[PDB]
Write a protein that binds this ligand. Structure first.
Ligand SMILES: Cc1c(C(=O)C2=C(O)CCCC2=O)ccc2c1c(=O)n(CC#C[Si](C)(C)C)c(=O)n2C
Ligand SMILES: Cc1c(C(=O)C2=C(O)CCCC2=O)ccc2c1c(=O)n(CC#C[Si](C)(C)C)c(=O)n2C
Ligand SMILES: [Co+2]
Ligand SMILES: [Co+2]
Lengths: 382, 382
């Protein structure tokens, strides 16, 4: 059931902003590891004395990396005279966020029809305001409300090129990397209590609920279900410790857990990312045992051929299935020092109408299949 | 003249420690950009609840990248029960250093005969103590004194593998990158006043002075002149603004300006680094005009053949010459967000006895030759 109860007009995921200690080094690592091009900048060379911000793109996926300069460079500015290109930025907020959480996502940005109206409706319906609507060069409007922890949901609306004050990046420093990633599929939060978190977000957006493992979870979705916001809470006192609880402890509370990036060819994406894992890119979780891939034939043998199942095994890809579609997924090890944020690469098969969002689910069924698969241990014991 | 006045026995440069916001992302970027292997770690997986530290190596060059975890993970520890592998580390010091200076060098570490004796003699001769001698597993001793700004000179001595508590890195995550870099040649500080800085450091080490451009500089050297510590001060009120003064402003005061890394084949190093500049590695300063390389024949045509001079032009390499040797050098753009720290790649020709340290100088003569070379403008004007 989709009651289409969005309280304002939501278009698509727009960008994700990481708050960094040094934006240059994180952006360069992510660019090489994920195959994202340098496409825009706002920094000292563009007249920004407040923060350094670098934009990477791959298809419609936009990753923004921002770090503060010395407050001394902008000591004489006030908000009416600021050189910052992102008006919500604050030196103290950014340093406090990073000191408290380490490297991670500050902003989940969605494009809306009217960011001022989205902000107003959201706050009227319970959203805690974070940054009021600011109109940039009479062209772009940006506003922010609190989502969970110190993560904000950022609204952006365009009258008619990322943000004013950003410059397109010099061709020489913009190598056209591309490993196949095309857009953000979903963005997932970890919280101590799922119930109140869902009630708060669903309350102010009108997003509806989208149709033993250490977690309980639920997914909020926009009218066309292309903006997907799962939220997890821990399940305490199990056999092994909950990964959600470990996250909360190492992150100092709620925050963004993972970003799921849709690829238009997950085989190529994973080949390219895995070649770079040990030369500056990203590491992947340990692959499932061969029994997992033998079990794939019975589960998805009508969707994937033997060779494609063999290719999944070569690359460590997980496979799950809905009553409507199929999901190919894999998870990176944490992106930084702390066992907190990580990335999921995904590709979805089915639900052709365009492909409907969330086709195939989120891989909940792979918790059971992975554990059952560990029966490779019992088979090796023989 | 070398009066060999070292007040304790100094061996060689041992390592350089960067204080980071996220050690993982900086270390991975540097590894790919410079061709340095992951060789040791101290982090949550080794039982360190205090800091994440990752060691990169290339030949005898050792770069250490350290960042603090949440203080909450180690809240119950005291120094007698710490899980930190580097006893001088402090969460508050590290966060304050990074918030104030951005990414940069915290420690210039030299190997000595006896770090406890080196520390004692140094402080008796005016050194401001930073961290007292600590003996690790009855095997390694480490002590620190203030060098300039918030940079420390760290002494390490070995009874007889980086530091106890560090684990050698798994072969799988240790790709054997190597672009030819072999050791640290010199480490350079920027300070507001050169005179007092030299007097302070030379006072407590006994290091001797080693034999219009916006700076005054001088070089302190150990007995065998293999530990080389240049220091710069700005020269105010010129035509263009002093790069030393820009550094001090953006760094919030004195700090490490550049690290000069000796290559055993600067042509190969620069080929490899330049191929990676726009896919996650390091950028280089703009190359000198062709007139610079035409002028090379008269200056060094007895040392470098035409083809080798052409290879320098292809790679943007600078060349200077002493009365004793020749220097090939090139400079990266700043390593992080701020126009502060950068890297020099160098290779020295001559002074064969082994090669004596500092053979060929530090390239002071290239300030004049670069400006004179800008006569390409007058030639193009014709
Ligand atoms: C993160 C994730 C998802 C997922 O994407 C998802 C959502 O999008 C919304 C719903 C809830 C949720 O979880 C799905 C499957 C996963 C993982 C994952 O992270 N891992 C890694 C480990 C482990 Si361990 C060693 C602590 C037992 C998996 O194995 N599977 C199988
Ligand atoms: C850093 C450096 C050195 C150097 O290593 C050195 C020492 O080791 C100890 C002594 C003092 C010192 O300087 C030498 C030459 C250099 C540079 C440099 O940084 N640059 C870059 C710019 C510039 Si601009 C656009 C602001 C005029 C050079 O061009 N040359 C030519
Ligand atoms: Co997911
Ligand atoms: Co130098």
């Amino acid at each position: 059931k989709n009651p289409k109860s969005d309280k304002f007009k939501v278009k698509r995921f727009h960008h994700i902003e990481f708050w960094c200690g040094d934006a240059t080094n994180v952006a360069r690592r992510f660019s090489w590891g994920l195959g994202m091009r340098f496409s825009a900048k706002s920094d000292l060379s563009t007249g920004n004395m407040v923060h350094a911000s670098y934009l990477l793109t791959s298809g419609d996926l936009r990753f923004l990396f921002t770090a503060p300069y010395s407050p001394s460079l902008s000591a004489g500015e006030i908000k009416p005279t600021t050189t910052a290109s992102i008006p919500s930025f604050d030196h103290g907020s950014c340093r406090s966020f990073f000191s408290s959480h380490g490297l991670g996502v500050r902003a989940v940005a969605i494009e809306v029809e009217d960011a001022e109206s989205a902000f107003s409706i959201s706050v009227a319906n319970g959203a805690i305001p974070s940054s009021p609507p600011i109109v940039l060069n009479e062209a772009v409007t940006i506003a922010e409300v609190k989502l969970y922890g110190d993560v904000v949901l950022r609204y952006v609306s365009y009258k008619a090129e990322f943000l004013p004050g950003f410059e397109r990046v010099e061709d020489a420093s913009s190598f056209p990397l591309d490993y196949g990633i095309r857009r953000l599929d979903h963005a997932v939060g970890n919280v101590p209590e799922l119930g109140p978190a869902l009630t708060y977000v669903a309350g102010f957006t009108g997003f509806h609920q989208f149709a033993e493992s250490g977690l309980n979870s639920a997914v909020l979705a926009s009218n066309d279900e292309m903006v997907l916001l799962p939220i997890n809470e821990p399940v305490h006192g199990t056999k092994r410790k909950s990964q959600i609880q470990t996250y909360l402890e190492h992150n100092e509370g709620a925050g963004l857990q993972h970003l799921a990036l849709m690829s238009e060819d997950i085989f190529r994406t994973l080949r390219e990312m895995r070649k770079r894992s040990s030369i500056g890119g990203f590491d992947f979780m340990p692959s499932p045992p061969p029994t997992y891939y033998q079990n794939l034939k019975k589960r998805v043998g009508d969707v994937l051929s033997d060779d494609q199942i063999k290719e999944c095994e070569e690359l460590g890809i997980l496979v799950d299935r809905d009553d409507q579609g199929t999901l190919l997924q894999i998870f990176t090890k944490p992106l930084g020092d702390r066992p907190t944020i990580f990335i999921e690469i995904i590709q979805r098969v089915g639900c052709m109408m365009y492909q409907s969002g969330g086709c195939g689910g989120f891989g909940k069924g792979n918790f059971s299949e992975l554990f059952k698969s560990i029966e490779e241990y019992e088979k090796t014991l023989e």
